[PDB]
Design a protein around this ligand. Structure first.
Ligand SMILES: [Cu+2]
Ligand SMILES: [Cu+2]
Length: 440
Protein backbone atom coordinates (compact mmCIF):
# COMPACT_ATOMS: atom_id res chain seq x y z
CA UNK A 1 0.00 0.00 0.00
CA UNK A 2 1.19 3.46 -0.96
CA UNK A 3 4.80 4.10 -1.99
CA UNK A 4 7.11 1.09 -1.94
CA UNK A 5 10.53 1.08 -0.28
CA UNK A 6 12.93 -1.88 -0.60
CA UNK A 7 13.10 -3.78 2.71
CA UNK A 8 13.64 -7.46 3.55
CA UNK A 9 10.66 -9.76 3.97
CA UNK A 10 9.76 -10.14 7.65
CA UNK A 11 9.17 -13.50 9.35
CA UNK A 12 7.38 -13.16 12.70
CA UNK A 13 7.01 -15.45 15.67
CA UNK A 14 3.50 -16.83 16.19
CA UNK A 15 2.23 -18.05 19.56
CA UNK A 16 5.71 -17.69 21.04
CA UNK A 17 7.57 -19.68 18.39
CA UNK A 18 9.55 -18.66 15.31
CA UNK A 19 10.18 -21.89 13.39
CA UNK A 20 11.82 -21.41 10.00
CA UNK A 21 13.92 -23.39 7.53
CA UNK A 22 16.54 -21.12 5.97
CA UNK A 23 18.62 -22.31 3.01
CA UNK A 24 22.02 -20.77 2.26
CA UNK A 25 22.16 -21.07 -1.51
CA UNK A 26 23.66 -19.36 -4.57
CA UNK A 27 20.94 -17.18 -6.04
CA UNK A 28 20.68 -15.16 -9.27
CA UNK A 29 19.06 -11.82 -8.51
CA UNK A 30 18.44 -8.35 -9.88
CA UNK A 31 20.92 -5.88 -8.39
CA UNK A 32 21.46 -2.19 -9.22
CA UNK A 33 20.27 -2.65 -12.79
CA UNK A 34 22.08 -5.94 -13.45
CA UNK A 35 21.82 -9.63 -12.65
CA UNK A 36 24.26 -11.24 -10.25
CA UNK A 37 24.53 -14.59 -8.53
CA UNK A 38 25.03 -13.99 -4.81
CA UNK A 39 25.10 -16.28 -1.81
CA UNK A 40 21.87 -15.69 0.11
CA UNK A 41 19.74 -16.88 2.99
CA UNK A 42 16.18 -17.65 1.93
CA UNK A 43 16.73 -16.51 -1.66
CA UNK A 44 17.02 -12.79 -0.89
CA UNK A 45 19.69 -10.13 -0.34
CA UNK A 46 19.53 -9.12 2.47
CA UNK A 47 18.16 -12.29 4.03
CA UNK A 48 14.76 -12.20 5.73
CA UNK A 49 14.20 -10.17 8.89
CA UNK A 50 13.28 -12.37 11.85
CA UNK A 51 11.01 -10.52 14.28
CA UNK A 52 10.48 -11.86 17.78
CA UNK A 53 9.41 -10.83 21.27
CA UNK A 54 11.22 -11.66 24.52
CA UNK A 55 10.68 -15.22 25.83
CA UNK A 56 9.93 -16.42 22.28
CA UNK A 57 11.49 -19.68 21.14
CA UNK A 58 13.54 -19.51 17.93
CA UNK A 59 14.01 -22.71 15.90
CA UNK A 60 16.05 -21.87 12.80
CA UNK A 61 17.14 -24.81 10.65
CA UNK A 62 20.02 -23.69 8.41
CA UNK A 63 20.30 -25.92 5.36
CA UNK A 64 23.69 -25.51 3.71
CA UNK A 65 23.32 -25.50 -0.06
CA UNK A 66 26.68 -23.75 -0.59
CA UNK A 67 29.77 -25.37 -2.13
CA UNK A 68 31.69 -24.91 1.15
CA UNK A 69 31.03 -25.38 4.88
CA UNK A 70 29.38 -22.59 6.84
CA UNK A 71 27.75 -21.76 10.17
CA UNK A 72 25.73 -18.94 11.76
CA UNK A 73 26.69 -16.33 14.33
CA UNK A 74 23.71 -14.77 16.13
CA UNK A 75 25.38 -11.40 16.40
CA UNK A 76 24.67 -9.60 19.66
CA UNK A 77 22.31 -12.21 21.10
CA UNK A 78 23.15 -13.12 24.75
CA UNK A 79 22.41 -16.84 24.39
CA UNK A 80 24.45 -19.99 25.08
CA UNK A 81 27.72 -20.36 23.12
CA UNK A 82 26.67 -23.99 22.65
CA UNK A 83 23.86 -22.65 20.46
CA UNK A 84 25.82 -19.69 19.02
CA UNK A 85 28.79 -21.96 18.45
CA UNK A 86 31.66 -20.21 16.62
CA UNK A 87 33.45 -23.57 16.12
CA UNK A 88 30.60 -25.50 14.48
CA UNK A 89 30.96 -26.49 10.83
CA UNK A 90 27.96 -27.43 8.68
CA UNK A 91 29.27 -29.31 5.62
CA UNK A 92 27.74 -28.71 2.18
CA UNK A 93 24.39 -30.50 1.93
CA UNK A 94 23.88 -30.81 5.70
CA UNK A 95 21.53 -28.95 8.06
CA UNK A 96 21.68 -27.67 11.61
CA UNK A 97 18.84 -26.45 13.83
CA UNK A 98 19.64 -23.55 16.16
CA UNK A 99 17.16 -23.45 19.06
CA UNK A 100 17.11 -20.76 21.73
CA UNK A 101 14.85 -18.65 23.92
CA UNK A 102 14.88 -14.86 23.57
CA UNK A 103 16.02 -13.27 26.87
CA UNK A 104 13.32 -11.49 28.85
CA UNK A 105 14.81 -7.97 28.97
CA UNK A 106 16.33 -7.95 25.47
CA UNK A 107 15.35 -5.34 22.88
CA UNK A 108 16.76 -3.88 19.70
CA UNK A 109 18.27 -4.86 16.37
CA UNK A 110 20.60 -7.82 15.94
CA UNK A 111 21.73 -9.81 12.95
CA UNK A 112 22.91 -13.18 11.66
CA UNK A 113 25.83 -14.01 9.36
CA UNK A 114 28.50 -16.71 8.76
CA UNK A 115 31.27 -17.34 11.27
CA UNK A 116 33.33 -20.21 9.81
CA UNK A 117 36.90 -19.07 10.52
CA UNK A 118 38.93 -18.52 7.36
CA UNK A 119 35.87 -18.00 5.14
CA UNK A 120 33.89 -15.26 6.92
CA UNK A 121 34.92 -12.41 4.65
CA UNK A 122 34.14 -14.02 1.26
CA UNK A 123 30.86 -15.46 2.59
CA UNK A 124 29.64 -12.23 4.18
CA UNK A 125 30.73 -10.20 1.14
CA UNK A 126 28.83 -12.58 -1.16
CA UNK A 127 25.50 -11.68 0.50
CA UNK A 128 24.98 -14.01 3.53
CA UNK A 129 23.39 -11.73 6.15
CA UNK A 130 20.06 -10.81 7.65
CA UNK A 131 18.52 -8.87 10.50
CA UNK A 132 16.87 -9.98 13.72
CA UNK A 133 14.55 -7.57 15.55
CA UNK A 134 13.48 -8.07 19.15
CA UNK A 135 10.30 -6.07 19.87
CA UNK A 136 9.93 -4.33 23.23
CA UNK A 137 7.05 -3.17 25.41
CA UNK A 138 8.59 0.29 24.95
CA UNK A 139 7.43 0.16 21.29
CA UNK A 140 3.88 0.77 22.55
CA UNK A 141 4.40 4.25 24.05
CA UNK A 142 2.71 6.78 21.73
CA UNK A 143 5.95 8.62 20.91
CA UNK A 144 7.29 5.43 19.28
CA UNK A 145 4.07 3.65 18.33
CA UNK A 146 3.05 6.35 15.85
CA UNK A 147 6.54 6.69 14.32
CA UNK A 148 7.02 5.27 10.84
CA UNK A 149 9.45 2.36 11.23
CA UNK A 150 11.96 1.04 8.71
CA UNK A 151 14.99 -1.22 8.75
CA UNK A 152 18.05 0.05 6.81
CA UNK A 153 20.67 -2.63 6.12
CA UNK A 154 23.86 -0.87 5.01
CA UNK A 155 25.97 -3.19 2.88
CA UNK A 156 28.28 -2.47 -0.03
CA UNK A 157 29.13 -4.78 -2.90
CA UNK A 158 31.44 -5.16 -5.87
CA UNK A 159 30.67 -7.38 -8.85
CA UNK A 160 32.91 -8.99 -11.43
CA UNK A 161 31.44 -11.22 -14.13
CA UNK A 162 28.03 -11.31 -12.48
CA UNK A 163 29.40 -12.67 -9.18
CA UNK A 164 30.85 -11.12 -6.02
CA UNK A 165 34.28 -9.71 -6.81
CA UNK A 166 37.12 -11.89 -5.47
CA UNK A 167 39.27 -10.78 -2.57
CA UNK A 168 42.58 -9.18 -3.60
CA UNK A 169 45.80 -9.07 -1.54
CA UNK A 170 44.94 -5.50 -0.60
CA UNK A 171 41.50 -6.60 0.63
CA UNK A 172 43.00 -8.98 3.19
CA UNK A 173 45.03 -6.06 4.58
CA UNK A 174 42.44 -3.28 4.50
CA UNK A 175 39.15 -5.15 4.49
CA UNK A 176 37.12 -5.17 1.28
CA UNK A 177 34.92 -2.24 0.30
CA UNK A 178 32.76 -2.26 -2.78
CA UNK A 179 31.77 0.35 -5.33
CA UNK A 180 28.01 -0.37 -5.02
CA UNK A 181 26.91 1.21 -1.73
CA UNK A 182 23.48 -0.34 -1.16
CA UNK A 183 20.57 0.12 1.25
CA UNK A 184 18.49 -3.06 1.71
CA UNK A 185 20.16 -4.40 -1.45
CA UNK A 186 19.06 -1.35 -3.49
CA UNK A 187 21.10 1.51 -4.96
CA UNK A 188 19.96 4.92 -3.64
CA UNK A 189 16.29 4.05 -3.01
CA UNK A 190 13.73 6.75 -2.23
CA UNK A 191 11.71 6.65 1.01
CA UNK A 192 8.50 8.67 0.69
CA UNK A 193 7.65 9.22 4.35
CA UNK A 194 3.98 8.94 5.27
CA UNK A 195 4.57 10.15 8.86
CA UNK A 196 6.59 13.10 10.11
CA UNK A 197 8.44 11.05 12.75
CA UNK A 198 10.50 8.13 11.53
CA UNK A 199 12.14 5.36 13.52
CA UNK A 200 15.05 3.91 11.55
CA UNK A 201 16.84 0.74 12.60
CA UNK A 202 20.35 0.97 11.13
CA UNK A 203 22.60 -2.05 10.53
CA UNK A 204 26.14 -1.88 9.20
CA UNK A 205 26.53 -5.32 7.62
CA UNK A 206 29.51 -4.38 5.44
CA UNK A 207 32.83 -6.23 5.61
CA UNK A 208 34.86 -3.11 6.34
CA UNK A 209 33.15 0.07 5.11
CA UNK A 210 32.35 2.72 7.73
CA UNK A 211 29.23 4.92 7.46
CA UNK A 212 29.51 8.41 8.96
CA UNK A 213 25.76 8.99 8.65
CA UNK A 214 24.22 12.44 8.32
CA UNK A 215 20.78 13.51 7.11
CA UNK A 216 20.58 16.84 5.30
CA UNK A 217 19.13 19.62 7.48
CA UNK A 218 18.23 17.19 10.27
CA UNK A 219 19.75 15.88 13.49
CA UNK A 220 19.34 12.27 14.48
CA UNK A 221 17.93 11.30 17.87
CA UNK A 222 19.63 8.08 18.98
CA UNK A 223 17.34 5.85 21.04
CA UNK A 224 19.09 2.47 20.81
CA UNK A 225 22.65 1.16 20.41
CA UNK A 226 23.78 -2.36 19.39
CA UNK A 227 22.23 -4.30 22.23
CA UNK A 228 19.41 -2.19 23.62
CA UNK A 229 17.81 1.14 24.38
CA UNK A 230 19.53 4.26 25.62
CA UNK A 231 18.27 5.76 28.87
CA UNK A 232 16.84 8.75 26.97
CA UNK A 233 17.10 10.08 23.40
CA UNK A 234 20.46 11.62 22.53
CA UNK A 235 20.56 14.22 19.75
CA UNK A 236 23.49 13.93 17.32
CA UNK A 237 24.34 15.82 14.15
CA UNK A 238 25.89 12.66 12.67
CA UNK A 239 26.40 9.02 13.63
CA UNK A 240 29.44 6.83 12.89
CA UNK A 241 28.49 3.17 12.34
CA UNK A 242 31.42 0.78 12.22
CA UNK A 243 31.10 -2.74 10.72
CA UNK A 244 28.78 -4.90 12.83
CA UNK A 245 27.26 -1.99 14.77
CA UNK A 246 23.56 -1.18 14.94
CA UNK A 247 21.61 1.86 16.02
CA UNK A 248 18.05 3.03 16.14
CA UNK A 249 17.33 6.73 15.59
CA UNK A 250 14.25 8.92 15.49
CA UNK A 251 14.02 11.42 12.63
CA UNK A 252 11.75 14.46 13.10
CA UNK A 253 10.76 15.90 9.73
CA UNK A 254 10.02 19.61 10.18
CA UNK A 255 9.66 20.83 6.58
CA UNK A 256 8.60 19.38 3.26
CA UNK A 257 11.38 18.54 0.86
CA UNK A 258 13.77 15.88 -0.42
CA UNK A 259 16.72 15.21 1.91
CA UNK A 260 19.74 13.03 1.29
CA UNK A 261 20.96 10.50 3.82
CA UNK A 262 24.71 10.47 3.21
CA UNK A 263 27.77 8.56 4.38
CA UNK A 264 30.17 11.51 4.85
CA UNK A 265 33.96 11.22 4.35
CA UNK A 266 35.66 9.09 6.99
CA UNK A 267 39.33 8.04 7.10
CA UNK A 268 39.60 4.67 8.83
CA UNK A 269 43.33 4.36 8.27
CA UNK A 270 43.27 2.10 5.23
CA UNK A 271 46.52 1.86 3.30
CA UNK A 272 47.06 2.45 -0.40
CA UNK A 273 49.76 1.35 -2.82
CA UNK A 274 52.32 3.69 -4.32
CA UNK A 275 54.05 3.78 -7.70
CA UNK A 276 54.09 7.12 -9.53
CA UNK A 277 55.18 10.13 -7.47
CA UNK A 278 54.31 13.78 -6.92
CA UNK A 279 52.40 14.14 -3.67
CA UNK A 280 52.63 14.55 0.13
CA UNK A 281 51.55 11.77 2.50
CA UNK A 282 50.05 9.46 -0.14
CA UNK A 283 50.71 6.04 1.36
CA UNK A 284 47.33 6.23 3.19
CA UNK A 285 44.09 5.91 1.27
CA UNK A 286 42.67 8.87 3.20
CA UNK A 287 38.99 9.70 3.70
CA UNK A 288 36.26 7.86 1.83
CA UNK A 289 34.39 9.73 -0.80
CA UNK A 290 30.92 10.89 0.27
CA UNK A 291 28.11 8.59 -0.78
CA UNK A 292 24.39 9.13 -1.06
CA UNK A 293 22.63 6.27 0.69
CA UNK A 294 18.98 7.17 0.08
CA UNK A 295 16.60 10.02 -0.61
CA UNK A 296 14.08 10.94 2.09
CA UNK A 297 10.92 12.73 0.96
CA UNK A 298 8.99 14.39 3.78
CA UNK A 299 5.17 14.27 3.90
CA UNK A 300 3.12 17.37 3.18
CA UNK A 301 2.65 19.72 6.15
CA UNK A 302 4.83 17.60 8.48
CA UNK A 303 4.09 17.79 12.22
CA UNK A 304 6.46 15.46 14.08
CA UNK A 305 5.77 13.75 17.38
CA UNK A 306 7.37 14.91 20.62
CA UNK A 307 10.35 12.84 21.66
CA UNK A 308 9.90 10.30 24.45
CA UNK A 309 11.17 11.79 27.71
CA UNK A 310 12.77 8.51 28.83
CA UNK A 311 13.47 5.06 27.41
CA UNK A 312 15.03 2.23 29.43
CA UNK A 313 17.01 2.63 32.68
CA UNK A 314 20.34 0.97 32.47
CA UNK A 315 20.94 -1.63 35.22
CA UNK A 316 23.72 -0.73 37.62
CA UNK A 317 26.48 -3.28 37.34
CA UNK A 318 28.36 -4.83 40.27
CA UNK A 319 31.99 -3.95 40.89
CA UNK A 320 34.39 -5.87 38.59
CA UNK A 321 36.44 -8.83 39.79
CA UNK A 322 39.29 -8.79 37.23
CA UNK A 323 40.96 -6.42 34.77
CA UNK A 324 42.06 -7.72 31.39
CA UNK A 325 44.29 -6.07 28.80
CA UNK A 326 43.94 -6.99 25.13
CA UNK A 327 46.38 -5.26 22.78
CA UNK A 328 45.55 -5.18 19.08
CA UNK A 329 48.51 -5.08 16.69
CA UNK A 330 49.00 -5.50 12.93
CA UNK A 331 51.62 -6.47 10.35
CA UNK A 332 50.14 -4.76 7.30
CA UNK A 333 52.35 -6.13 4.54
CA UNK A 334 51.91 -9.75 5.67
CA UNK A 335 48.25 -8.85 6.37
CA UNK A 336 48.43 -10.57 9.74
CA UNK A 337 46.67 -9.32 12.84
CA UNK A 338 47.27 -10.13 16.49
CA UNK A 339 45.75 -9.88 19.94
CA UNK A 340 48.46 -9.74 22.63
CA UNK A 341 50.95 -10.75 19.94
CA UNK A 342 49.17 -13.98 18.90
CA UNK A 343 47.03 -15.08 15.97
CA UNK A 344 43.84 -17.08 16.50
CA UNK A 345 44.24 -20.75 17.34
CA UNK A 346 40.96 -22.61 17.82
CA UNK A 347 42.72 -25.11 20.12
CA UNK A 348 44.03 -22.39 22.45
CA UNK A 349 42.06 -20.69 25.23
CA UNK A 350 43.30 -17.16 25.82
CA UNK A 351 41.10 -15.89 28.69
CA UNK A 352 39.43 -17.90 31.47
CA UNK A 353 36.66 -16.13 33.36
CA UNK A 354 33.98 -16.83 35.95
CA UNK A 355 30.26 -17.02 35.27
CA UNK A 356 28.16 -14.53 37.27
CA UNK A 357 31.01 -12.02 37.58
CA UNK A 358 31.84 -8.67 36.01
CA UNK A 359 35.23 -7.96 34.42
CA UNK A 360 36.77 -4.78 33.05
CA UNK A 361 38.44 -5.24 29.67
CA UNK A 362 40.99 -2.68 28.47
CA UNK A 363 41.17 -3.08 24.71
CA UNK A 364 44.07 -1.12 23.23
CA UNK A 365 44.46 -0.44 19.50
CA UNK A 366 48.22 -0.28 18.91
CA UNK A 367 47.69 -0.37 15.14
CA UNK A 368 47.27 2.39 12.59
CA UNK A 369 43.78 1.39 11.33
CA UNK A 370 40.42 1.60 13.05
CA UNK A 371 39.57 -1.86 14.45
CA UNK A 372 35.97 -2.51 15.60
CA UNK A 373 36.16 -4.92 18.56
CA UNK A 374 33.35 -7.52 18.93
CA UNK A 375 32.69 -9.95 21.82
CA UNK A 376 30.28 -12.84 21.31
CA UNK A 377 27.64 -13.89 23.83
CA UNK A 378 28.40 -11.26 26.49
CA UNK A 379 27.14 -7.70 25.81
CA UNK A 380 29.19 -5.02 27.51
CA UNK A 381 29.02 -1.42 28.67
CA UNK A 382 31.66 0.94 27.25
CA UNK A 383 32.87 3.15 30.11
CA UNK A 384 35.47 5.21 28.28
CA UNK A 385 37.63 5.52 25.18
CA UNK A 386 40.95 7.32 25.32
CA UNK A 387 40.38 8.13 29.01
CA UNK A 388 37.18 10.11 28.35
CA UNK A 389 33.59 9.02 29.12
CA UNK A 390 31.33 7.30 26.62
CA UNK A 391 28.40 9.57 25.63
CA UNK A 392 25.53 7.22 26.65
CA UNK A 393 24.65 4.13 28.69
CA UNK A 394 23.43 1.11 26.73
CA UNK A 395 24.44 -2.45 25.91
CA UNK A 396 26.96 -2.71 23.08
CA UNK A 397 28.64 -5.69 21.44
CA UNK A 398 30.97 -3.79 19.03
CA UNK A 399 33.17 -0.83 19.99
CA UNK A 400 35.22 1.09 17.46
CA UNK A 401 38.83 1.87 18.34
CA UNK A 402 40.78 4.39 16.30
CA UNK A 403 44.57 4.13 16.18
CA UNK A 404 45.96 4.44 19.70
CA UNK A 405 42.59 4.43 21.46
CA UNK A 406 42.06 2.35 24.61
CA UNK A 407 38.50 1.32 25.51
CA UNK A 408 37.52 0.33 29.04
CA UNK A 409 34.57 -2.08 28.97
CA UNK A 410 32.46 -3.57 31.75
CA UNK A 411 31.79 -7.17 30.70
CA UNK A 412 29.27 -9.18 32.73
CA UNK A 413 29.97 -12.85 32.08
CA UNK A 414 26.65 -14.65 31.54
CA UNK A 415 26.43 -18.08 29.94
CA UNK A 416 29.11 -20.72 30.51
CA UNK A 417 31.08 -22.07 27.58
CA UNK A 418 33.76 -21.28 25.03
CA UNK A 419 33.26 -18.24 22.81
CA UNK A 420 35.33 -15.74 20.83
CA UNK A 421 36.17 -12.07 20.51
CA UNK A 422 37.52 -10.60 17.28
CA UNK A 423 37.84 -7.59 15.03
CA UNK A 424 34.68 -7.08 12.98
CA UNK A 425 36.56 -5.99 9.91
CA UNK A 426 35.99 -9.62 8.98
CA UNK A 427 39.10 -9.90 6.79
CA UNK A 428 41.19 -9.10 9.89
CA UNK A 429 39.38 -11.86 11.80
CA UNK A 430 40.13 -14.31 8.96
CA UNK A 431 43.79 -13.17 9.02
CA UNK A 432 44.42 -13.46 12.77
CA UNK A 433 42.61 -11.02 15.03
CA UNK A 434 40.49 -13.38 17.11
CA UNK A 435 40.93 -15.01 20.52
CA UNK A 436 39.09 -17.49 22.72
CA UNK A 437 37.28 -16.79 26.00
CA UNK A 438 36.12 -19.66 28.22
CA UNK A 439 33.56 -18.95 30.96
CA UNK A 440 33.05 -21.39 33.84
CU1 LIG B 1 28.79 -10.00 13.54
CU1 LIG C 1 40.66 -5.01 12.40
Amino acid sequence: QGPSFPEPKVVRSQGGLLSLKLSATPTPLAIAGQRATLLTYGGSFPGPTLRVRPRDTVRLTLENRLPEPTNLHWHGLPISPKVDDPFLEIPPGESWTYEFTVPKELAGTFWYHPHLHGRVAPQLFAGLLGALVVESSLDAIPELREAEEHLLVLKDLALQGGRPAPHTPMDWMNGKEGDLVLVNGALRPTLVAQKATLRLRLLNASNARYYRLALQDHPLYLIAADGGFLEEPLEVSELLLAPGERAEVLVRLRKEGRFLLQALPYDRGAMGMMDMGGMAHAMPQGPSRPETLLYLIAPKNPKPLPLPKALSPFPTLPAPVVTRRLVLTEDMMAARFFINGQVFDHRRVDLKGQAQTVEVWEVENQGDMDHPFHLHVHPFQVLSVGGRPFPYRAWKDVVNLKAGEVARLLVPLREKGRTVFHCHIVEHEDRGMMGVLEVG
